[PDB]
Design brief:
246 residues, seven-stranded parallel beta sheet, lipid metabolism (chains B, D), homotetramer, 8 helices, alpha/beta, EC 1.3.1.9 (chains B, D), binds nicotinamide-adenine-dinucleotide, oxidoreductase (chains B, D), SDR_fam (chains B, D), Rossmann fold, NAD (chains B, D)
């Protein structure tokens, strides 16, 4: 496995449908040792169960709204691990009412603030707090984005602005940390209900992508095989974004 | 002029170095009738004076931190104008300390929040509040962005994230309002010496570097940005929406120069 | 008119449906003085008629396959004009059989060569030959491209490669000539038969663009109003390219 | 390895400095079985020797100027392999004189034609000729591009146009073959000291500049490019097609550094 020896912290795994679960599974198959965060105490048992199945008992509460909690994750993780080789950002949130219907009607200041804070600021926040553990290790950060960053899409609305902020965050983080041996890259994943049918009917592959396909791309981006790649957004959408008038 | 009789609301004009002043002047030269906002009471006299020189006495206070103030602008403007043909977003802010040195060291939650709220959310916020006055008119919105949206750049730091959010905001606003006959476009301007620009550490170096490295071998002017905005606000650009146009003398498309 | 005093050479005007005609009309409405090329002697009378309606009697034969003919246009034009303020490239060609069906089946070496030579090399070829007349005048070049440069599109096939070469040509020409006061920009126009219905149903404006809308954008890019813009591809497609999953 | 038993044809390997050698080595480390092409008879011995070290004795002459030769490669390869899982395009050329100084002065019709034919048409030409052997296998194609596709760069000149054509070729090939289970992706590599690179005037300056200005503060290696290619040739990347991946240490996304 090309992640043998790599210690990787994975955020956002709340079920076996999660993109973060696909990533966790892919990484574990390549020999990585894993740790996980969970947003609220309600989910602890569920995440520990999933973690145990991936041979891990390193599970920490982390609401990225809280600087204290973010920093506490690494303080706790540092008691088990000498350093951190991989960091997976697979976290996004916006109020449901902002993700429906007319873009301007659905938007509000508070929804904008929440979306950006949780979905975009969380990348640099986590990179900043992880920096002591990651620097000098030839380590890597991977974050999940979506086509809404660069195209107007129905319903995605304010989340598109937040993903754009995120992708820029990826570039600035990469430029910031490259000299000290930390890479930062993004994956823009295809959708994973009629929207699914649209993508599958319109993309070069004529099908939707899987969490395994996203997961394997993340595993690659977290490994030394991708050591020449930083500040990149890789599209795992079966070529959807590069097709038009299909 | 190609904006003859078009009614245009311009934000962000605080001096004759302002990009918004360049835009205002360009629009007025093409026959537009103008109105202006100003962020705080301390600037009112200055902005009224500048407005008067551009043949306008429609001036309104607007801190885009405040939904009350944003919406009040259009309630007040509506007493004078039956509709609005143009809206110019030329507003940005981030705490100075976040715009200097190492990206992660300089960033904070609060600075991120402020930068995005003032510099990015303000676009849809203004479009939303202007929508009743603009819809059904073949009207247009223009906002100012910067290369930090799409490239990592020293010192610009968290503002780059905010500009990226803004540019996506431009696309989503365009997609949202196109059916109602309102267009929304961006201009990514090259560096220009303005009050806000002096907030960025080592700005004079960015300016010197661009002039030495762009195809035109010089920096752009507020007039050049202004004329591009005037075009994007006019019916001449009626086939263009959701676009970011680079007015940077070709800097962004050059490398290893 | 914002093109008063501007002398502009326009290629590719073969009918009043031509994008080049829209450009010519738009430019003339803003006060420009025009000249025209035509590819073959068969079209001379038609183009002279159109030119006369746009108040011009400066019409020259030019097959861009021929260096001699390209250079001869400027030798002849130079007897009437002191300099050249605007150059409009609105020329594209590929064999019809390469523009239908499966991309690889439809392609051939000869079709590729022809498409690129006529549709892409013609930009630098014309810029090169115009350079003595255009330099130091604060002049401008505009070329027409299409979404096939940057997206895979059905049927457009090898022309997509040629347009990509063209757009890169625009950037390299802009970088080359900027110091001597010549700008070079592109317009990526929307389509102008079911494809039309698709774009009109899917773009932000919910309609197709007109030759007038393309023409006015060209007029702007040829004027001093756009003096801060070079090496740019401006999309006049009603926002189609920036929309997805619509 | 993640390419265990995958059969991969590699073009463009003429020395151990070649990007194609880096790719070949990376693929072989992951269990792939390899075959190689060489442009002229004068290089045959060298390429056979290199191939033998990568456990291969499948070596074929192919000048991509010739449709006969391109198609003959697959006719000959088909005697040994029942199908093809991977195809690597690592070939480029333009006359030296077109790669030096002023873009327009240096360009000519003939140089343009040659550059595009050898460097861009060769991708679809090879994909087309490989199609019967590759279809229905979940196979993959990888081609090498450079930043000149999307930025104006000194000296690269007409090659930039050719690389742009190539990248569009990658997208069109991907859209064409996806239904048959063949993927097609590109790698835009940072500058690397190779035989072909020495064709570009002032290449050593491009190399020095990139290392001083990219996020990683160093140039990339053929191993880094090679491992990315191996990934793109494998089932691990089965969700990726029509993509240009930048292996340049983040150079293209940095500005004003
Ligand atoms: N599924 C898709 O179609 C798709 C496509 C592209 C990108 N993405 C992105 O991938 C990422 C993962 O989403 P998913 O599709 O696996 O959905 P998911 O619900 O499985 O995962 C989203 C995760 O974000 C976490 N989260 C939300 N608020 C948080 C907070 N305050 N602190 C910490 N964690 C918080 C949730 O707990 C959840 O585990 C998201 O960033 C999403 O935008 C998803
Ligand atoms: N000058 C440059 O180099 C440059 C380049 C590209 C883009 N821009 C952008 O152009 C726009 C205008 O900036 P400028 O360069 O003319 O500087 P400027 O200082 O003249 O204008 C900035 C304006 O933003 C306004 N503003 C700040 N906070 C506000 C708030 N809470 N409410 C309302 N208004 C507020 C200021 O009052 C000021 O009028 C900004 O979006 C900036 O990011 C500037
Ligand atoms: N109509 C569209 O949908 C559309 C959209 C985007 C871009 N474009 C581009 O706009 C340009 C103009 O095309 P159009 O749509 O007006 O079609 P058109 O047929 O009106 O114009 C194409 C012109 O190219 C000229 N041409 C062809 N071969 C030539 C040669 N060897 N020498 C000189 N001239 C030659 C033709 O004579 C013709 O006048 C083309 O480059 C085209 O690709 C068209
Ligand atoms: N070295 C770099 O800095 C760099 C960076 C990005 C991309 N690239 C690209 O990588 C690819 C490989 O180049 P490299 O850097 O390994 O140089 P190289 O000299 O090792 O390889 C170039 C190859 O192209 C082959 N070639 C040239 N003309 C040919 C023809 N008519 N038929 C068949 N093959 C032919 C040569 O024989 C040689 O094997 C090229 O596409 C190049 O443009 C190189």
């Amino acid at each position: 496995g090309f992640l043998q020896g790599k210690k990787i912290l994975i955020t956002g795994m709340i079920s076996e449908r999660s993109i973060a679960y696909g990533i966790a599974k892919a990484c574990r198959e390549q020999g990585a040792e894993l740790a996980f965060t969970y947003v609220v105490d309600k989910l602890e048992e569920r995440v520990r169960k999933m973690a145990a199945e991936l041979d891990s008992e390193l599970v920490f509460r982390c609401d990225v709204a809280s600087d204290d909690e973010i920093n506490q994750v690494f303080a706790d993780l540092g008691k088990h691990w000498d350093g951190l080789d991989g960091l997976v950002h697979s976290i996004g949130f916006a109020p449901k009412e902002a993700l429906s219907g007319d873009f301007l009607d659905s938007i509000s200041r508070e929804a904008f603030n929440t979306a950006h804070e949780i979905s975009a600021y969380s990348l640099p926040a986590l990179a900043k707090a992880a920096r002591p553990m990651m620097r000098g290790r030839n380590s890597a950060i991977v974050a999940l984005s979506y086509l809404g960053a660069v195209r107007a899409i129905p319903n995605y609305n304010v989340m598109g602005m937040a993903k754009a902020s995120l992708e820029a965050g990826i570039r600035f983080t990469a430029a910031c940390l490259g000299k000290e041996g930390i890479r930062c890259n993004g994956i823009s994943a295809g959708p994973i209900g009629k929207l699914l049918g649209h993508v599958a009917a319109h993309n070069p592959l004529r099908r939707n992508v899987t969490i395994e396909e996203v997961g394997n791309t993340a595993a690659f981006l977290l490994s030394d095989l991708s050591s020449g790649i930083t500040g990149e957004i890789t599209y795992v959408d079966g070529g959807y974004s590069i097709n038009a008038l299909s």
